[PDB]
Design a protein around this nucleic acid. Sequence first.
DNA 1: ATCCCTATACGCGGCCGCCCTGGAGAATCCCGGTGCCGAGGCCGCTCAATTGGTCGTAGACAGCTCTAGCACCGCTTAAACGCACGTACGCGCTGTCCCCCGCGTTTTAACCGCCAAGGGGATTACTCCCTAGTCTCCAGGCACGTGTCAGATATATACATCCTGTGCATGTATTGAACAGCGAT
DNA 2: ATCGCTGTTCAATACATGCACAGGATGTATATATCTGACACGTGCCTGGAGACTAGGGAGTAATCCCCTTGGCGGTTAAAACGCGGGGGACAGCGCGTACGTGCGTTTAAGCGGTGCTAGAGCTGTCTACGACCAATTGAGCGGCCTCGGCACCGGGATTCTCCAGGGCGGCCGCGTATAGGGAT
Lengths: 94, 93, 120, 97, 78, 77, 455, 107, 108
Amino acid sequence: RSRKESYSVYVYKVLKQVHPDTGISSKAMGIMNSFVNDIFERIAGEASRLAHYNKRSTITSREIQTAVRLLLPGELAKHAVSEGTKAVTKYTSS
Amino acid sequence: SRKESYSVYVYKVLKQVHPDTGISSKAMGIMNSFVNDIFERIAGEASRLAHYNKRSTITSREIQTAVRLLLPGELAKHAVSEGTKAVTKYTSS
Amino acid sequence: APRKQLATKAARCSAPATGGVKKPHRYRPGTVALREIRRYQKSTELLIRKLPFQRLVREIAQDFKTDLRFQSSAVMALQEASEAYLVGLFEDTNLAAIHAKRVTIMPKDIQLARRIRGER
Amino acid sequence: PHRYRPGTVALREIRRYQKSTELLIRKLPFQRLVREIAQDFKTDLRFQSSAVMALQEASEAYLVGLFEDTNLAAIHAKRVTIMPKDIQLARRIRGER
Amino acid sequence: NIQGITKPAIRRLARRGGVKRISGLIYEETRGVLKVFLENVIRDAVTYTEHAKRKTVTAMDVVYALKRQGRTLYGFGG
Amino acid sequence: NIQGITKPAIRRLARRGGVKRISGLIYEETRGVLKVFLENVIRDAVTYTEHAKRKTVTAMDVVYALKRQGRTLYGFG
Amino acid sequence: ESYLSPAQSVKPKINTEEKLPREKLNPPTPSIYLESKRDAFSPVLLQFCTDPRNPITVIRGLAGSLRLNLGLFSTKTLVEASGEHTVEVRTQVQQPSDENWDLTGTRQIWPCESSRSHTTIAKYAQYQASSFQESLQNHHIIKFGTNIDLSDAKRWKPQLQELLKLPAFMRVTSTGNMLSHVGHTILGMNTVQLYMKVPGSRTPGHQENNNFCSVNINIGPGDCEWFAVHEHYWETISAFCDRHGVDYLTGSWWPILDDLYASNIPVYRFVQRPGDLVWINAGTVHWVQATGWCNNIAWNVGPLTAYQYQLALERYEWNEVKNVKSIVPMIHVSWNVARTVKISDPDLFKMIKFCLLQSMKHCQVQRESLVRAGKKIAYQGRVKDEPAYYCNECDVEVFNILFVTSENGSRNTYLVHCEGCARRRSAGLQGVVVLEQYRTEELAQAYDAFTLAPA
Amino acid sequence: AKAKTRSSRAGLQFPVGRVHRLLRKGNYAERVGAGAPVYLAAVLEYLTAEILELAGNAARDNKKTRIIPRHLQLAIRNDEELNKLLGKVTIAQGGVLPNIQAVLLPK
Amino acid sequence: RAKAKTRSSRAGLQFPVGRVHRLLRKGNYAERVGAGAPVYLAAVLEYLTAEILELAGNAARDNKKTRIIPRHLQLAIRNDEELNKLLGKVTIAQGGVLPNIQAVLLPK
DNA sequence: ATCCCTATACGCGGCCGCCCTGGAGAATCCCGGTGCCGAGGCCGCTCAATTGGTCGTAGACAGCTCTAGCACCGCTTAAACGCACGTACGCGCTGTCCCCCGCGTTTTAACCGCCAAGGGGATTACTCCCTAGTCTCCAGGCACGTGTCAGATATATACATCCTGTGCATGTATTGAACAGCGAT
DNA sequence: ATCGCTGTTCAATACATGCACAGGATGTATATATCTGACACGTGCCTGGAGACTAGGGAGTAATCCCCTTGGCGGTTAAAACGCGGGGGACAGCGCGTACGTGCGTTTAAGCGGTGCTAGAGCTGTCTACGACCAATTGAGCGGCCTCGGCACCGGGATTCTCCAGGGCGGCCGCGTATAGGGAT
Ligand SMILES: *CCCCCCC(=O)N(O)CCC(=O)O
Ligand SMILES: [Fe+3]
Ligand SMILES: [Zn+2]
């Protein structure tokens, strides 16, 4: 009856981007959905704490970037920050 | 500007449990940090409880459940008793 | 120089045991253990029986709330968590045993691995 | 020449340092180490005195706890001396390596 | 009912954990450790379930109780 | 400069921890462990301060970094 | 090699191809009593036990009068005399009396159930006690206690200590028992052995290895059915050994009256009772069944009596040519006996003389063709109570000279070689040390020392 | 109109009003119940009073009036419940509990 | 109005910028959410998913399989060091363990 | 001036040795075969994201103060360093005894398929109770200033403790004595 | 029987640890004395909490469905349980030499007190863009469906490691050996 949203629709698109001839099982898809939800929660909570520390009431791209710097480990942090900056530039430009 | 701390109330509780004992400044800072820590813990757990059940308010139920989930056993029992008594007295007045 | 260490089997007298039914082939103690290690380190299936685990879970939960029904996925998740926890604990216990210059993991190894991890 | 047998002054020091709360590291060398470590991340950083004190307190707590765990790791292997392998085991079993 | 977790099952768990030789007394200790862990997680899950005014422990309750203990689990829900 | 944590300092820390005998190779190990711990904590604190568009590393930044790593520190706010 | 021929033989001769009625095929066997120590100790009783006329004699109540604490041999105080030890047991099926049928359930085949097994002593004690009272008050299975070592007198001190109030020849070993003179402790041969069993327990028929005389005391409370046969009919077994396929030596088989009935072998059927004693004469192939929960104290001795030695050496020769394992070195035993015994009979005099001369001759030839062409002829010296060294590629006894080298072994253990196997080794011998413990001069001196006292 | 602090109404010493304001401005939920601040303040006061009683006993056991961080550390690390609630917390100037492994005590 | 262009397309992403904005607004993390927070968060999540899925696909191909099961995800996570650090305190249900035997346990 | 005669350089040939090499046999893997069920693409819909415009305030910017972070000096002395000595402790080797492992056999209960009931989770619907918001009034608690007494530092003292050189006491590594087995006379 | 010899079985003797036990240095717990600066209080006021009313949406309660959780039955099939034999490993014990603890002398630099400069944290006022809010719209993603290939089970042969032999070519050991020339007669 009532709907249940999930990141499977976009996870499969990302998979088709990476491996254009590979699939994914249902259990693996659930694992990936849980991973996406967990990382979202971590980053969002860290950004909220960052905004609360500095007496801000809005979460901006800077808060997300600093949360990514704090959470992701080493090289992954740099790559994710670069991707996010490029995405925001593309979004604002267009 | 004007800071806020629990030092004013931590000293009342002290006087209600050890009338002739004082507290230093480092110790008072430790007590204030401890109160802040426990407040953050309980509030976050209650917020998670409210969000999980597809609700949008935090009430005595959520606070009691968070106290049960975070406090270890006997502390939890006594804290729940005291909180329920406090809410009862507050409502009665 | 003087050897004087010549030796042989010791004599004995016994009622005949005809037939001599015996099993000669045996693996040395340890090789099959390594085989089991390899076999279970390349699989993903659970190593505990489901029904006994469900019975234990219900027996434990009986002390918290009565008439507590369990979703099947709930018990499956509990089993997965418990077995992963035990596998990690056993890895740390084996590390402690190897630290102590032994190969046999003993209860003291488990106790040390739990104390260091902060789990009382 | 009254000489104490080995290990008798060690226990006295253990008792003396467990009864106390003072910071065991000299403040100036620790401050210099903190500044040197920070200069790699950001340049021309200024540290509050309270920040350096908090860093030193946290470092002392971490090292004391690690030494307790390493002492446990040493006693299990039938030894009174702690060594680098004991510390490495305490760190591995701790999930920080 | 803790005897359901048998010696062969504990041997399989240890083998997956990389253990080669297993002491005789380790099985009882493992049973106690498993019982302690299960008690903690099940108590948290039952608290979660009681909050929702329910009577069946859902997979989400177990996942939340585990994440509360510092043992996040993937593949049984959010 | 890392050598500023002298051998007597590490011996005092071990004594407080309970160690009775100390090997000769443990001082270098302790220096490495302390360097790694301080590096992680200081990187977290410097990121925290840099977010606030500041040049001074406040005691609150260190406390937040410690809370984030998993070492909650009382007595500094 | 050959050490025996038709020159020394006291062995009475009868032909297996004989005819026997039921009386001769089932006659009561000579039996006696004992009313004093002097009876058994007197030469009359000992000779009766060394007498070819009687296949076996019963000393009824011998312990019943002297009252030695054979009840201390009881498995009760045995457990209160041992908690942990080895008790070899032969698993067997509980057939009633003499009905050891087969799978089809209506045949009596010669082959019998005889399977090895062992565990802790207390395990067998528990099993036998429980199966007792018929397992807390045919169809049944029965573990069979056999050859339980008793070579130590410490844990069994009352037993062995009280087991000396009898004559030397009926004693474990003494100057009247050649087993003392072998310098060894042959298990189940020269040191008494106790074997517990349940009702129906069966030790398949056999002749005691080397054909010694046997001293058997069922301390009970169990009883025993018996089937004694004199030595003449021994090859008779072999006869039906071919007919029913079983073998006469080291095999497994429980005869039946008709089985050897075509052999016309009589059957000295009788029994004993708690506390009794019996002398199974050397050469008596006997098959026993403990029809009740019991425990035997049995061992083997040979009095210097002439008949004993000749009735015995036949088995030694058999084994030598049958590659069959023996349990007593006659060569070495003949030496120490001919070296430190009051040999006072011409019969046994020449009897030993012949094979001793053959031993001298073969050792002579061995060293002669192999002294320098041999390999470092060594002089070990034969330290006192050296265990008799037996080959392993053939098992034959190695006397004086021998071929022993550390055959690898991380602990460097030593293996023994004889001339017969030196062959499989290589041309003559090439690789194994030679160690002879008696110079020909010393052995010749001992030979000269051998004399017939005028006793 | 007659003012009355909600702490007095509930019988508490900790501030119900301040706790309510913190719960409202800390972004925990869209709404905050009337009894939630009272319950949370009562629990906080209970925990504070328990640890304070333990610390005062520890300090008096040392012949001192003022409570310092060492007494707080002793109270937290001695009692098992408080030790478990604060098992991953470092108290500044708290020190360590006095213990020595018996294996190290002189033979 | 004009042809509605999904916010994800403008950001050049494949994760839902609008859905991430919805979750941020309804998750009571902050009083207000900037226009750039959803885009940044969606891009970061998509990058992390791409990394994990590329490693898992390589692991699956090594195994001679077309689909991806949780075992392949566990292998990919526990091999890469940074991913293992990020997900160090996680357990993948039905994933198993990384094969390893202490060098001393090997037969002498 | 000649006999000597056994320890010394010589040898060679046994001696162990340490790996190599072979079959035999349980393991596990890979190729070919068949079949099922779940993942993947399609379809209908509905509700959530987009568009488009307005309102209010949150944060960005400029200006400005007064805090405290840094840097200096000059000295006291407290602690770190280096060295010499010895001891006890970590580490290797050896020995034993025993307790886990590999295996076979009995049994037992986990598991799969299917049936069947109903308890409770999940949803929709209606109603009101409660929480956010707004305004105003005023009380508590925060910053600042003061004094006084608890705790730190010092001294001199009496005491607890550890290290070493005394003694007795005792069960045992090591003696004579008291049993005898044992035999030719 | 006995005048000798003999193996056992008992007691008696000597010796080094367990432990008192003195002294005596050394470090420690203590008790009175003194003074500092941090706590505990008071003062004013001013930002935040409380009183009062509104207005609206979240939550509570009920009614209903139907999913799925439990209860059960039978047979089949692997997995558990029990017992056995044996070797490999845990534990102890002894040797040793090496590296760490202790104490003392030398001296490096941290702690401390001032003292001044200024870089920046922190406050205040302005206003401007940007995020929330709302109405209308449609097309993105979700719930079902169907289907067809990837994977799962199966069988049968192909390596392939284990695990015992059996040696074959390098080592040292050690027995043997030849002796002969400096010493002694
Ligand atoms: C060599 C093993 C047997 C020793 C001789 C006794 C024997 O064989 N028994 O069957 C004992 C029967 C008896 O006489 O008690
Ligand atoms: Fe016989
Ligand atoms: Zn031979």
